[PDB]
Symmetry: D2
């Protein structure tokens, strides 16, 4: 008779694993991940910051791209996260071992990271990755500064309880560019209504749409570039179609409301 | 050009995942795992002890077999481990959540369990499983008692730094039966000589062969039943060919010495 | 010249350490702490729940009072917390070791408990106690059930980020009694305005006053009994002067507003 | 009647808390702790290593002395430990927060550090300090390298299960100086015989005396300088009376044997 099933790997679309060379976003900020997963390197005079790392197998590629930017592994000071799912926080444990960087995250993200994404409220154990510890717990609105560049956290729970937007002001052409790295606002396959593991899920998403609308933003980026209409594969045109924060929140809320009604409709 | 490779699942021989009904080993001790992975249930008047759980996907099967033995999930008091690899400690996190059982383990096993088997000294991240915490740290020779049944730990590092044998005295036919659950003594694909991550690996294995030879033992069991010549599929004959501790240690040391010479021979 | 100062113990008023016999609050609910620190035992047909434990040195007294109630150490299933300061979560690590109970707490409380109250946002390292791990992370509004008794969490951040109210329905004289165990709403010596470690502190307190006002409540209790006008020393009259949730929130908000104005006034 | 006792601070002799200016031990190695607690700074071209930090309240003094040596807080790369008691690992959590340094330690030291020294096998909760996590787990004989300087770990369990000696080769007057930082070999107030929490304590101490005798050593230092006959207060004569490793082990074993006989004599 049937044995128990084999473990199943977390597999993703090939484009999520397609390496790309560093793509400059602003004077200090570079996309160094893959064509379809964001990993932002912010280079300061006193070390570098990494916002997300993508999938677990991207660790070596990130370090290669850091080197192309002039950033040795030991020059990475800080890792920040949008949320601690395997496709965004995947390589954090290995990056910490190889660079000595600290991780700063809120308490929800810290607990999810420390169990390697296992016992996910919606996905169970299907997206487990190597666990890592947060070295600094941050609060809503708290400012983290590296090399004089200030990163502000904005909690936007929903996609995960610890989902966070990060904002900072870079420059281009002598003018300030307020960058907003807003987290995912999707709820893929989630039970939204009356979820015993997340009883206030709908209230949190609804508040998070409003938080995203209010972010300081001249240039929006998202963990999945397509969610904000970026196309990392087309170089200097990558940002051309990028959404505003208002438009990103509006699109996400329309999808959310439609899913809520479909969930009511079985 | 080539994308990065997909993550690869830890896949195992089908027999390792083949469920079996509880097989009685002695008056209080039952094999409740699969045909080719040991999971021992020891039933006391004040709750049950589980020694190993096998693969992550075995959690539900273990609880089903516990129920057949009269053990409700909440009746499981304690989980002990041979070593914290995915094929023996796989379901520990889920079992803790569903039963409330505590885990007792030495410090090496505790740290490996808490990172879900990631950053393995020999296997890297290939056998990651859901992380779990140890609630009680135990020392070499320490006695853990449940319902009056005393379990003694014997450290036998090598296969993992935290590899542990557990001994207890059960009964059969009114006579004592000294059970020894000795850990794996294999080194599959390991660099044995001059390993920078495990510099005293050879000294530890050699000492562990001697520890196994000295265990109090009328009946030897091992995490992989074939390592001690058990055959769980043949019921009342399962133990017929089981090795002594002396013979298990001798076979393991001969394989180890041969591998050492082959490693010297490239 | 002066050596560095000696470490300073966290010392408290004597009444906080004055043992008392169990005081019945409702049919299943007992105050089993000290005259001036709440520790609530809820006894079910399938084990007991403890809400808070007081100071670290109260562990033995709590177990003595449990025994007087018919609760053996192993009968304690679950520990819940108001917040993870030393005077309320102090003995949690020792209670877990001696009872096997699981701890359920939100992520903020879990991270503070796991560092033993060290690096407190307001108190630094002055109130460090033995660290403990949370076995179950709970979300706002999540229901935890033991022996059929359902406990609902209501997040009320401010006094700590993880501050939680717990509600359950007990009985007395054949009628339901909705019990609300609401956390502290004090801010003792806290910098309220522009606090870089807690930038939205004021917004959180203000929301928490509203949450407390809305709790289902026939009988309010608080970690410090005086905060809700209980007097545990007078037995059957202990609850006579107890505040409503509305009155507790109103008193706390008036104190908060006054402190805010004094902080503005240097 | 009597309330429960107040918590008691871990108080130490004043000389353990008496700051001193940096005292040069060899070309790259400086004592930067207090007159009676060792904290060794090793300065490399690629950052600094700290071996022990003393008491929790010494964090600021250590950073001041680092600054006098030209080491900014961010220049500290690595913290190593002799053992994780409050008088040697006390300030590790704060140093990690303020410097970004990683901690490397064996599994036993890592688990004790992570519970802040609470639930000590011999001292209970009396010497609890702020918990910290180890970022790198090291094995017996493993080499950790910073700026080209190689530090080798030698496990010497007894005083704690995780007690470790660290060796490295510095220079003086153009000649190599093999430095051995050997851990404590005391057993203050310990039950040595038949200790249920440490059943092989005597075997471990006896092996550790032999390990210390075998260390590569031109210059021995110890966490308590008096244990190896150092006197940090007399500057250029501080090392004059320092013991050899053989003499340190011999003195420690004689004290141990005498205590064993006194323990046998009640
Ligand atoms: C829109 C998506 C969907 O894809 C990923 C996601 N999901 C998946 O990759 C995918 C899925 O939802 O179909 C999945 C595959 C396998 C699983 O075991 C779980 C999820 O990553 C975990 C998720 O967060 O839902 N992430 C997002 C996102 O917004 O970040
Ligand atoms: C003899 C073996 C080999 O099989 C397992 C083992 N190995 C494997 O299952 C297998 C292998 O060694 O070929 C393996 C598959 C995939 C991997 O990524 C790593 C290891 O489990 C992790 C191991 O510990 O070596 N365990 C033992 C054992 O003695 O416990
Ligand atoms: C109103 C108070 C004040 O007393 C305690 C408290 N504070 C103290 O006990 C006390 C103080 O605030 O004066 C204190 C003594 C010593 C310290 O190091 C820190 C705080 O416990 C940590 C606190 O949370 O502020 N708790 C409350 C409370 O509402 O729970
Ligand atoms: C010889 C000693 C004695 O002093 C310290 C020690 N002990 C004490 O400081 C002291 C004592 O043993 O008398 C102590 C004071 C208070 C306590 O709660 C516990 C211990 O530090 C924890 C210890 O490790 O035993 N350390 C050593 C040592 O060798 O490192
Ligand atoms: Zn996601
Ligand atoms: Zn995603
Ligand atoms: Zn294995
Ligand atoms: Zn195996
Ligand atoms: Zn408090
Ligand atoms: Zn309090
Ligand atoms: Zn010590
Ligand atoms: Zn000491």
């Amino acid at each position: 008779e049937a044995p128990l099933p084999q473990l199943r790997a977390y597999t993703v679309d090939a484009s999520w694993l397609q390496p790309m060379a560093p793509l400059q976003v602003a004077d200090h900020t570079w996309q160094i991940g893959t064509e379809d997963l964001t990993a932002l390197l912010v280079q300061t005079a006193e070390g570098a910051v990494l916002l997300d790392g993508g999938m677990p197998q991207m660790a070596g590629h990130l370090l290669d791209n850091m080197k192309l930017r002039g950033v040795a592994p030991q020059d990475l000071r800080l890792i920040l996260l949008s949320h601690a799912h395997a496709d965004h926080a995947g390589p954090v444990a290995e990056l910490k071992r190889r660079t000595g960087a600290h991780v700063a995250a809120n308490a929800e993200t810290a607990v999810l990271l420390a169990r390697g994404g296992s016992n996910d409220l919606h996905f169970g154990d299907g997206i487990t990755y190597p666990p890592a510890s947060a070295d600094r717990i941050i609060m809503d609105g708290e400012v983290v500064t590296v090399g004089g560049i200030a990163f502000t956290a904005h909690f936007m729970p929903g996609h995960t309880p610890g989902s966070t937007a990060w904002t900072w002001t870079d420059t281009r052409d002598g003018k300030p560019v307020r960058i907003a790295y807003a987290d995912s606002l999707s709820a893929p396959g989630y039970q939204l209504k009356g979820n015993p593991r997340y009883p206030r899920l709908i209230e949190d998403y609804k508040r998070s749409f409003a938080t995203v609308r209010a972010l300081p933003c001249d240039l929006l980026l998202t963990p999945h570039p397509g969610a904000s209409n970026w196309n990392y594969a087309v170089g200097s045109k990558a940002s051309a179609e990028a959404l505003t924060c208002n438009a990103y929140a509006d699109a996400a809320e329309k999808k959310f409301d439609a899913q809520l009604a479909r969930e009511t409709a079985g």
